[PDB]
Design a protein around this nucleic acid. Structure first.
Length: 61
RNA sequence: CGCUAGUACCGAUUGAAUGGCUUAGUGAGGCCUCAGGAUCUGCUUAGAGAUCUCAGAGCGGA
């Protein structure tokens, strides 16, 4: 990103979070986001997807 | 700590199927035999009027 020096780089970068390394750190999964879809809780959560679909095909048989 | 994939022994389905051995009994089928005789057919006394059936009865053979 190429900052405009005229404008304050604080308001642009309010929501950003700095990290040592993406791979190493840990986020708690969501946040008080409010640019998420509010239907985030209106989503089916899945465990092991393998242990979902073989079960469902098993019930389909 | 617990839940999820993975691999071998029992064990029930009286399961339910494949073969091996084995008990006892049955055993088709040809073939060889003991009979059989549907039937078919020779010859002869012989039936009827001059290689003619008009009844049969023997002697046979397939």
């Amino acid at each position: 990103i190429e900052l405009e020096p005229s404008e304050s780089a604080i308001e642009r970068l309010k929501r950003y979070r700095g990290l040592k390394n993406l791979y190493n750190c840990d986020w708690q999964v969501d946040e008080k986001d409010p640019s998420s879809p509010a239907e985030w809780k209106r989503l089916l959560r899945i465990g092991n997807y393998k242990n979902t679909k073989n079960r469902i095909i098993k019930e389909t048989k």
